Design an enzyme around this catalytic site. Structure first.
Site, mmCIF file in Angstrom:
data_model
loop_
_atom_site.group_PDB
_atom_site.id
_atom_site.type_symbol
_atom_site.label_atom_id
_atom_site.label_comp_id
_atom_site.label_asym_id
_atom_site.label_seq_id
_atom_site.Cartn_x
_atom_site.Cartn_y
_atom_site.Cartn_z
ATOM 1 N N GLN A 172 0.791 -1.316 0.178
ATOM 2 C CA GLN A 172 -0.044 0.158 -0.115
ATOM 3 C C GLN A 172 0.880 1.380 0.141
ATOM 4 O O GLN A 172 0.959 2.135 -0.766
ATOM 5 C CB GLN A 172 -1.032 0.127 1.189
ATOM 6 C CG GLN A 172 -1.941 1.168 1.364
ATOM 7 C CD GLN A 172 -3.030 0.711 2.580
ATOM 8 O OE1 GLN A 172 -2.335 -0.050 3.248
ATOM 9 N NE2 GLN A 172 -4.171 1.456 2.359
ATOM 10 N N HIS A 176 1.058 3.994 -3.148
ATOM 11 C CA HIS A 176 0.299 5.118 -3.488
ATOM 12 C C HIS A 176 1.319 6.368 -3.361
ATOM 13 O O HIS A 176 1.177 7.353 -3.395
ATOM 14 C CB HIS A 176 -0.318 5.337 -1.685
ATOM 15 C CG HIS A 176 -1.580 4.640 -2.000
ATOM 16 N ND1 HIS A 176 -1.594 3.371 -1.176
ATOM 17 C CD2 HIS A 176 -2.854 4.852 -2.190
ATOM 18 C CE1 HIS A 176 -2.804 2.893 -1.080
ATOM 19 N NE2 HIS A 176 -3.792 3.785 -1.652
ATOM 20 N N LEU A 353 -5.802 -2.734 -11.497
ATOM 21 C CA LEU A 353 -5.106 -4.097 -11.483
ATOM 22 C C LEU A 353 -4.368 -4.328 -10.112
ATOM 23 O O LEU A 353 -4.678 -5.453 -9.489
ATOM 24 C CB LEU A 353 -4.033 -4.423 -12.323
ATOM 25 C CG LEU A 353 -2.897 -5.563 -12.366
ATOM 26 C CD1 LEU A 353 -2.467 -6.097 -13.623
ATOM 27 C CD2 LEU A 353 -1.947 -5.337 -11.308
ATOM 28 N N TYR A 354 -4.102 -3.287 -9.337
ATOM 29 C CA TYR A 354 -3.350 -3.297 -8.144
ATOM 30 C C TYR A 354 -4.215 -3.095 -6.934
ATOM 31 O O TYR A 354 -3.697 -3.171 -5.724
ATOM 32 C CB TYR A 354 -2.116 -2.097 -8.048
ATOM 33 C CG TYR A 354 -1.042 -2.555 -7.475
ATOM 34 C CD1 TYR A 354 0.154 -2.991 -8.199
ATOM 35 C CD2 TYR A 354 -0.832 -2.332 -6.298
ATOM 36 C CE1 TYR A 354 1.398 -3.487 -7.504
ATOM 37 C CE2 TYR A 354 0.380 -2.652 -5.261
ATOM 38 C CZ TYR A 354 1.588 -3.389 -6.273
ATOM 39 O OH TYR A 354 2.662 -3.572 -5.526
ATOM 40 N N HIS A 357 -6.907 -5.400 -1.980
ATOM 41 C CA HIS A 357 -7.546 -5.476 -0.654
ATOM 42 C C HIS A 357 -7.889 -6.846 0.101
ATOM 43 O O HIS A 357 -7.831 -6.740 1.193
ATOM 44 C CB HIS A 357 -9.084 -4.556 -0.831
ATOM 45 C CG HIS A 357 -8.779 -3.202 -1.406
ATOM 46 N ND1 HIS A 357 -8.657 -3.120 -2.732
ATOM 47 C CD2 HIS A 357 -8.453 -2.012 -0.872
ATOM 48 C CE1 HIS A 357 -8.629 -1.961 -2.862
ATOM 49 N NE2 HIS A 357 -8.381 -1.190 -1.882
ATOM 50 N N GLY A 495 0.301 -7.957 -14.606
ATOM 51 C CA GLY A 495 0.924 -6.820 -13.679
ATOM 52 C C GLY A 495 2.346 -6.852 -13.578
ATOM 53 O O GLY A 495 2.886 -5.605 -13.367
ATOM 54 N N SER A 499 4.855 -3.584 -13.234
ATOM 55 C CA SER A 499 5.855 -3.578 -12.377
ATOM 56 C C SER A 499 7.360 -3.369 -12.668
ATOM 57 O O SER A 499 8.045 -2.515 -12.311
ATOM 58 C CB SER A 499 5.633 -4.682 -11.436
ATOM 59 O OG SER A 499 4.208 -4.740 -10.740
HETATM 60 C C1 HEM Z 1 -6.572 -0.786 5.509
HETATM 61 C C2 HEM Z 1 -7.121 -1.450 4.147
HETATM 62 C C3 HEM Z 1 -7.248 -0.466 3.036
HETATM 63 C C4 HEM Z 1 -8.064 0.592 3.160
HETATM 64 C C5 HEM Z 1 -9.135 0.801 4.394
HETATM 65 C C6 HEM Z 1 -8.363 0.998 1.947
HETATM 66 C C7 HEM Z 1 -8.995 2.174 1.315
HETATM 67 C C8 HEM Z 1 -9.081 2.610 0.248
HETATM 68 C C9 HEM Z 1 -10.159 3.369 -0.333
HETATM 69 C C10 HEM Z 1 -11.372 3.819 0.660
HETATM 70 C C11 HEM Z 1 -9.792 3.856 -1.478
HETATM 71 C C12 HEM Z 1 -10.530 4.591 -2.479
HETATM 72 C C13 HEM Z 1 -9.598 5.656 -3.020
HETATM 73 C C14 HEM Z 1 -10.301 6.861 -3.622
HETATM 74 O O1 HEM Z 1 -11.352 7.065 -3.864
HETATM 75 O O2 HEM Z 1 -9.543 7.933 -4.074
HETATM 76 C C15 HEM Z 1 -8.590 3.175 -1.754
HETATM 77 C C16 HEM Z 1 -7.977 3.282 -2.927
HETATM 78 C C17 HEM Z 1 -6.922 2.335 -3.228
HETATM 79 N N1 HEM Z 1 -6.444 1.347 -2.579
HETATM 80 FE FE1 HEM Z 1 -6.879 0.953 -0.791
HETATM 81 N N2 HEM Z 1 -7.364 0.577 1.166
HETATM 82 C C18 HEM Z 1 -6.828 -0.523 1.714
HETATM 83 C C19 HEM Z 1 -5.600 -1.243 1.610
HETATM 84 C C20 HEM Z 1 -5.078 -1.201 0.229
HETATM 85 C C21 HEM Z 1 -3.978 -2.417 -0.149
HETATM 86 C C22 HEM Z 1 -3.517 -3.417 0.879
HETATM 87 C C23 HEM Z 1 -3.808 -1.834 -1.212
HETATM 88 C C24 HEM Z 1 -2.898 -2.508 -2.243
HETATM 89 C C25 HEM Z 1 -1.700 -2.955 -2.088
HETATM 90 C C26 HEM Z 1 -4.693 -0.709 -1.812
HETATM 91 C C27 HEM Z 1 -4.654 -0.295 -2.879
HETATM 92 C C28 HEM Z 1 -5.436 0.878 -3.236
HETATM 93 C C29 HEM Z 1 -5.328 1.467 -4.345
HETATM 94 C C30 HEM Z 1 -4.530 1.139 -5.583
HETATM 95 C C31 HEM Z 1 -6.238 2.455 -4.374
HETATM 96 C C32 HEM Z 1 -6.639 3.520 -5.708
HETATM 97 C C33 HEM Z 1 -5.458 4.508 -5.973
HETATM 98 C C34 HEM Z 1 -5.771 5.899 -6.335
HETATM 99 O O3 HEM Z 1 -6.550 6.280 -7.156
HETATM 100 O O4 HEM Z 1 -5.500 6.633 -5.410
HETATM 101 N N3 HEM Z 1 -5.544 -0.475 -0.583
HETATM 102 N N4 HEM Z 1 -8.403 2.376 -0.645
HETATM 103 C C1 LIG Z 2 3.049 -12.302 -8.059
HETATM 104 C C2 LIG Z 2 4.147 -12.276 -9.265
HETATM 105 O O1 LIG Z 2 4.967 -13.578 -9.151
HETATM 106 N N1 LIG Z 2 5.998 -13.369 -10.295
HETATM 107 C C3 LIG Z 2 6.026 -12.002 -10.774
HETATM 108 C C4 LIG Z 2 6.826 -11.674 -11.856
HETATM 109 C C5 LIG Z 2 7.563 -10.590 -11.897
HETATM 110 C C6 LIG Z 2 8.297 -10.614 -13.038
HETATM 111 C C7 LIG Z 2 7.935 -11.551 -13.702
HETATM 112 CL CL1 LIG Z 2 8.264 -12.323 -15.392
HETATM 113 O O2 LIG Z 2 6.836 -12.333 -12.962
HETATM 114 C C8 LIG Z 2 4.774 -11.333 -9.943
HETATM 115 C C9 LIG Z 2 4.376 -10.094 -10.251
HETATM 116 C C10 LIG Z 2 5.049 -8.793 -9.711
HETATM 117 C C11 LIG Z 2 4.472 -7.571 -9.617
HETATM 118 C C12 LIG Z 2 3.277 -7.577 -10.494
HETATM 119 C C13 LIG Z 2 2.495 -8.312 -10.718
HETATM 120 C C14 LIG Z 2 2.990 -9.956 -10.809
#
Ligand code: HEM
Ligand SMILES: Cc1onc(-c2ccc(Cl)o2)c1-c1ccccc1
Ligand SMILES: *[C@@H]1O[C@H](CO)[C@@H](O[C@@H]2O[C@H](CO)[C@@H](O[C@H]3O[C@H](CO[C@H]4O[C@H](CO[C@H]5O[C@H](CO)[C@@H](O)[C@H](O)[C@@H]5O)[C@@H](O)[C@H](O)[C@@H]4O)[C@@H](O)[C@H](O)[C@@H]3O)[C@H](O)[C@H]2NC(C)=O)[C@H](O)[C@H]1NC(C)=O
Ligand SMILES: *[C@@H]1O[C@H](CO)[C@@H](O[C@@H]2O[C@H](CO)[C@@H](O[C@H]3O[C@H](CO[C@H]4O[C@H](CO[C@H]5O[C@H](CO)[C@@H](O)[C@H](O)[C@@H]5O)[C@@H](O)[C@H](O)[C@@H]4O)[C@@H](O)[C@H](O)[C@@H]3O)[C@H](O)[C@H]2NC(C)=O)[C@H](O)[C@H]1NC(C)=O
Ligand code: HEM
Ligand SMILES: *[C@@H]1O[C@H](CO)[C@@H](O[C@@H]2O[C@H](CO)[C@@H](O)[C@H](O)[C@H]2NC(C)=O)[C@H](O)[C@H]1NC(C)=O
Ligand SMILES: *[C@@H]1O[C@H](CO)[C@@H](O[C@@H]2O[C@H](CO)[C@@H](O)[C@H](O)[C@H]2NC(C)=O)[C@H](O)[C@H]1NC(C)=O
Ligand SMILES: *[C@@H]1O[C@H](CO)[C@@H](O[C@@H]2O[C@H](CO)[C@@H](O)[C@H](O)[C@H]2NC(C)=O)[C@H](O)[C@H]1NC(C)=O
Ligand SMILES: *[C@@H]1O[C@H](CO)[C@@H](O[C@@H]2O[C@H](CO)[C@@H](O)[C@H](O)[C@H]2NC(C)=O)[C@H](O)[C@H]1NC(C)=O
Ligand SMILES: CCCCCCCCO[C@@H]1O[C@H](CO)[C@@H](O)[C@H](O)[C@H]1O
Ligand SMILES: CCCCCCCCO[C@@H]1O[C@H](CO)[C@@H](O)[C@H](O)[C@H]1O
Ligand SMILES: CCCCCCCCO[C@@H]1O[C@H](CO)[C@@H](O)[C@H](O)[C@H]1O
Ligand SMILES: Cc1onc(-c2ccc(Cl)o2)c1-c1ccccc1
Lengths: 553, 553
Positions: A172, A176, A353-354, A357, A495, A499
């Site tokens: 996360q 971000h 894609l990313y 949650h 992905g 990445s």
């Molecule tokens: C506590 C856990 C989490 C909460 C409560 C949470 C909550 C949220 C919420 C409410 C949004 C809406 C965003 C917006 O409207 O601008 C959001 C967006 C997002 N969250 Fe989460 N999230 C969590 C964990 C994660 C995790 C673990 C990931 C990925 C590894 C993640 C990736 C994202 C992404 C990529 C966006 C949208 C990005 C953007 O345009 O800014 N979140 N999250």
């Molecule tokens: C999961 C996972 O396991 N191997 C991965 C990989 C990386 C390069 C090649 Cl080639 O494979 C990934 C991955 C890493 C980042 C995003 C999305 C997927």
């Protein structure tokens, strides 16, 4: 007249272009294929497709045979394979960028205006019957019914692969810095103009926050010191815009660079350990460079943190995700023999894609006690109540949720997964099988082939009507995972190109920047080459907790 | 303690870095050399320097032997040589960018903040005795004494090489799309963030002017029609910020995209012919694409004009400058086999290099009559009184001034050349011999070796004190020209890398953009491949005047 480009006539990255009133032509220029749809293979491309193994087969090779891979890792092939991985993946992504929310075609504006997210596949033309082109219902399934019946966590399904919360928080926080969709400008627009690992989540979207965040002495950053430990400063000492609840005291906020990092304690944890890192690097630089002004200590330390970050993300982060016996390796010199554009711009499909949650648990366990979401979210005190050590130890021990398979999103966070579906529809992404095709895969022929089961598959056919109409995010999360892996193949093959193109497109990886002078000599350059997650938490700490992207299995 | 990096210890692009209180280390990483100063050659680099001909010798080869070059041009070597020219030149320039007015070191800020001009060689450290490092006077010569006694045109010296005003105006107009130093932010800052051939001098620095300049129907631009001919619109119909005199009527201004183009009639003349071109291209696109909206006609036409521009600049503009029998060729595919970064950012030394004011005559001859500067500058009516034809004919017939040799700037424009000298000193450029070294040449050992004479040489030594202190702009303009050429070698070997790196670093030259689809199919793609100056003026005109970068010699 039906818009011809909604049949998706062009195969293999051919560009559909409209001529006359009802005609179309595919631009097959360097697609390696010929013909009116780009379907006639050239001799070499034919030879490559007849020799090209299945993606799942190569996944089999990379995930089996520990003996063979002990040999490979111990020899030079460990490098050649890495160079192959980097090259074949990064080639799938356009560089320079191509499309954006406003232009389904190459334009100078899509090139210049970096506040757009870019786009891998064009939009679905609006002058077409189906919202997904031509196949499916004339109105496609409800968003929160999909999300509720197909993504809602009924029981916790832990990651088969060892992934812990110390990882998920890292994903996360790390993510971000380049995903900052602005609700003010709308969908497909970013506040993070770096489009990569610029540490804009540590230093800010703009020079304003940066200046209001660093101490301007010895290149360090401002910082509080609570309980004898180092923390970020408050808006009182470093006043910068940051989202918080409307009641907490001002001496209880903290200033980081990402506006949202105050909310979850894990985010502010990483902000803390990174900040400590930066100031420590400043100390190490000034030890050898007594003559440098403040801003050179700052910029050099920032480059060192960017290098450490790409290092850890490749050799430990993506390593944990991959499960590969091949030890991945961060050596930008692997690409100095290749045609590679040191330049990244983020696509819509790559933050959609990313959205991982399902990694979040039912509860947040710290030590013997347990915090629910209502206790954990927005909590101002827990980060400083427990030492950074204790939080790293508690997060690195608690398993994280599996991402694929489906039905593994907690009900609290579930709403994000709903909006993304709706957001997909406003961004007009193509069908799942079309991205599936563009990343070197074959489209699924049935829903039951997608899910690997019969119940969700039957209902998915009842809702969507045709597999060619399934959506990007849903189908990506309902796909069957690989055996004992954290998610299925589509997340891998889609992905991974984004990445790696994003990690090595950073200009510090270029031949021009990748020198010991760029990092204040040899101490900082080796500080980038030897960076690890354990070094990052432990070198900025009084003791070493359990720190790892995997539980102590 | 004297700052060691002012001795310029590091040779051959080695990076001087300061250690301790009085120590330094050269980063020789890929300089091809070894040793503490980067002076010990590697085996291959030794083999290349012992076989590397003189730059003036290769200038001899390219400018002699019409028979041999008839053969070369008629065969495939005409391509291989071009690919060599493009590659060897562009390699001298850093990509990604390195330095700027604020940072003498690689930094994320110098990479991100595109409003800086970049920098090829670092600054002169302020903690050093001489303003040019260590050699020379403790205060160096007056700016307007140099400018008046060494650059002031005593008698007109015409270009030995045929260059005309239709060329010089093209150089000014073409150049001010990427040279927009902002007096508000100071020296080393730009308003043209495209940093290349984006036609920001036709469409604007920002989307605001762009929207206020195009008609939003069929993708065209707004335009007046005076005397039956097509011209730019006035601030009444297209209200955008543009510098003019404070008294002229509003129906007499015109709206272009470059704020200054109202002043000289040649600039507004190119604005006119380009605009006519754009609208003509819009017509050609909509002939085949009845279905496209306005903005796709716009963006596609813009890409077509960008291609036409690079085409003409390489095959006619730089051709006229070079005098080469080798016919230069714009084929972006020549670099598809190379490691090439499709990305440009403009350096300080490259607009300071490009101040070519000696190209301007004593007077401006049109037809049988003659206009002085006071009559020609700021003149609102002359552009429309004479047809665009008549102005192209009069400009393409009148010779332009030689750029090198010295003493050939008119007294009116002379003040610019003074400011540049002073501006050099605020930008803290290094000595002439240091840039001289970094662009693959040897530093001059005496002033008389520089000028090729004895009078100006003696006085230059009396003013500067040592040749190693001579300045960038002055020495670049006082250098002896090649025999019968428009300027000496330093302008060649320095300007050529910037010009070619800027012309082919455009993303339309990339493999990703360089397709017939990017330019609305085949008619626009061949419209870029077949562009010529004569096609540009004549296709947008009722008759053909004499149009050429050279007089009718
Ligand atoms: C506590 C856990 C989490 C909460 C409560 C949470 C909550 C949220 C919420 C409410 C949004 C809406 C965003 C917006 O409207 O601008 C959001 C967006 C997002 N969250 Fe989460 N999230 C969590 C964990 C994660 C995790 C673990 C990931 C990925 C590894 C993640 C990736 C994202 C992404 C990529 C966006 C949208 C990005 C953007 O345009 O800014 N979140 N999250
Ligand atoms: C999961 C996972 O396991 N191997 C991965 C990989 C990386 C390069 C090649 Cl080639 O494979 C990934 C991955 C890493 C980042 C995003 C999305 C997927
Ligand atoms: C990256 O791209 C985004 C999106 O393209 C940029 O942010 C957007 O920028 C847009 C323009 O800057 C903006 O859209 C505007 O939409 C209308 C435009 O209509 C204008 O023109 C007509 C008529 O002409 C008027 O001109 C004179 C001049 O002074 C007026 O007084 C007079 O009234 C005359 O009619 C009118 O309809 C209108 O009044 C406008 O003048 C505006 O009404 C909107 O308010 C808006 O300004 C858009 O909102 C921006 N945001 C988004 C999310 O699209 C972004 O800037 C860009 N980034 C970079 C770095 O380039
Ligand atoms: C590309 O780079 C250029 C130059 O780097 C950018 O344009 C420059 O931006 C600079 C910063 O935005 C700007 O410099 C500023 O310097 C003075 C003094 O800065 C103060 O900084 C801190 C701030 O303390 C403030 O705290 C409170 C909290 O809210 C403030 O209200 C209060 O006013 C107080 O000052 C002080 O500790 C310190 O002592 C300084 O006083 C500012 O006051 C100036 O107004 C100025 O903003 C500079 O002027 C800009 N221009 C130039 C030519 O340098 C450009 O933005 C950038 N581009 C991008 C895209 O990043
Ligand atoms: C009537 C003829 C010309 C006049 C009056 C003229 C005048 C000027 C003036 C007054 C400036 C001031 C720069 C500033 O303060 O920002 C300037 C800048 C410049 N001129 Fe000229 N010029 C002429 C022709 C040319 C030509 C033929 C060239 C071709 C190279 C040229 C190149 C430049 C450049 C590169 C700049 C600086 C760019 C910038 O920062 O914006 N000029 N000119
Ligand atoms: C290129 O793609 C189009 C769309 O899939 C193909 O066109 C269809 O072909 C079938 C079979 O003859 C027709 O019944 C449809 O009416 C066609 N649709 C359209 C929109 O033309 C086309 O055949 C493909 N090209 C080739 C060579 O097969
Ligand atoms: C934020 O976290 C702190 C813990 O650091 C919470 O306070 C703790 O609450 C648990 C039970 O909920 C107690 O057993 C601990 O003794 C408490 N410790 C301290 C120092 O207060 C706090 O309640 C949390 N915030 C919210 C809103 O739940
Ligand atoms: C690297 O560059 C420095 C500066 O040009 C050279 O240092 C000078 O060497 C002479 C001869 O030994 C001394 O008299 C000067 O005092 C030195 N100046 C400084 C600042 O050290 C140095 O010799 C060069 N390296 C080599 C191997 O020649
Ligand atoms: C701007 O140029 C016009 C030429 O088109 C000048 O007016 C002309 O001046 C010449 C001699 O100076 C006359 O022979 C023409 O008959 C004039 N034509 C017109 C239509 O006026 C005008 O004076 C110039 N502006 C300035 C300030 O000199
Ligand atoms: C044992 C051989 C290891 C080779 C490592 C290459 C890693 C990339 O293998 C991937 O295979 C996919 C199959 O669909 C392709 O789509 C991707 O383009 C390719 O990057
Ligand atoms: C015989 C014709 C040779 C064609 C190749 C000429 C292009 C190479 O140009 C070379 O560029 C180098 C770097 O800028 C300079 O150091 C050399 O002086 C110059 O010759
Ligand atoms: C292979 C054919 C070689 C022909 C001999 C060419 C000799 C070029 O002689 C050149 O004369 C120039 C002055 O005009 C000098 O500046 C150069 O240093 C010199 O090399
Ligand atoms: C003059 C002139 O003459 N030949 C030139 C040339 C082009 C490529 C090579 Cl290699 O040389 C140039 C030139 C070209 C661009 C900029 C500045 C100068």
């Amino acid at each position: 007249p039906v818009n011809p480009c909604c049949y998706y006539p062009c195969q293999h990255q051919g560009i559909c272009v409209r001529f006359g009133l009802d005609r179309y032509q595919c631009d097959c220029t360097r697609t390696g294929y010929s013909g009116p749809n780009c379907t006639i293979p050239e001799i070499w491309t034919w030879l490559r497709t007849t020799l090209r193994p299945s993606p799942s087969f190569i996944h089999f090779l990379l995930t089996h045979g520990r003996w063979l891979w002990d040999f490979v890792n111990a020899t030079f092939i460990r490098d050649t394979l890495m160079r192959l991985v980097l090259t074949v993946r990064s080639n799938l992504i356009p560089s320079p960028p191509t499309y954006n929310i406003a232009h389904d075609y190459i334009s100078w504006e899509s090139f210049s205006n970096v506040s757009y997210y870019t786009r891998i596949l064009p939009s679905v033309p609006r002058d077409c019957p189906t919202p997904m082109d031509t196949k499916g219902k004339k109105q496609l399934p409800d968003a929160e019914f999909l999300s509720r019946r197909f993504l809602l966590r009924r029981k916790f399904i832990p990651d088969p692969q060892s992934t812990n919360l110390m990882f998920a928080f890292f994903a996360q926080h790390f993510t971000h810095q380049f995903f900052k969709t602005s609700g003010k400008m709308g969908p497909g627009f970013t506040k993070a103009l770096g489009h990569g690992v610029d540490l804009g989540h540590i230093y800010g979207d703009n020079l304003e926050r940066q200046y209001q965040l660093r101490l301007f002495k010895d290149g360090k950053l401002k910082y509080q010191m609570l309980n004898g430990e180092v923390y970020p400063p408050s808006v009182e000492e470093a006043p910068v815009l940051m989202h918080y609840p409307r009641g907490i005291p001002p001496q209880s906020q903290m200033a980081v660079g990402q506006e949202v990092f105050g909310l979850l304690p894990g985010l502010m944890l990483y902000a803390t350990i990174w900040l400590r890192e930066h100031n420590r690097v400043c100390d190490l630089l000034k030890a050898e460079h007594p003559t440098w002004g403040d801003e050179q200590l700052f910029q050099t330390a920032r480059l060192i943190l960017i290098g450490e970050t790409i290092k850890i993300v490749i050799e430990e982060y993506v390593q944990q995700l991959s499960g590969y016996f091949l030890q991945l390796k961060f050596d930008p010199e692997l690409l100095f023999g290749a045609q590679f554009q040191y330049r990244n711009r983020i696509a819509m499909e790559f933050n959609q894609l990313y959205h991982w949650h399902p990694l979040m648990p039912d509860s947040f366990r710290v030590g013997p006690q347990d915090y629910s979401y209502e206790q954990f979210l927005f909590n101002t005190s827990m980060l400083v109540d427990y030492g950074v050590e204790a939080l790293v130890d508690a997060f690195s021990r608690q398993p994280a949720g599996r991402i694929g398979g489906g039905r593994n999103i907690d009900h609290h966070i579930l709403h994000v997964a709903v909006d993304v579906i709706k957001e997909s529809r406003v961004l007009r992404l193509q069908p799942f099988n079309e991205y599936r095709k563009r990343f070197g895969m074959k489209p699924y022929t049935s829903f039951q082939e997608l899910t690997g089961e019969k119940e969700m598959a039957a209902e998915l056919e009842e809702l969507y009507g045709d597999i060619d109409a399934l959506e990007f995010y849903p189908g990506l999360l309902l796909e069957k995972c690989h055996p004992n892996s954290i998610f299925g193949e589509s997340m891998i093959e889609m992905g991974a190109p984004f990445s790696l193109k994003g990690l090595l497109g950073n200009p510090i990886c270029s031949p021009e920047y990748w020198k010991a002078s760029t990092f204040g000599g040899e101490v900082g350059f080796n500080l980038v080459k030897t960076a690890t997650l354990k070094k990052l938490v432990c070198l900025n700490t009084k003791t070493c907790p359990y720190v790892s992207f995997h539980v102590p299995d």
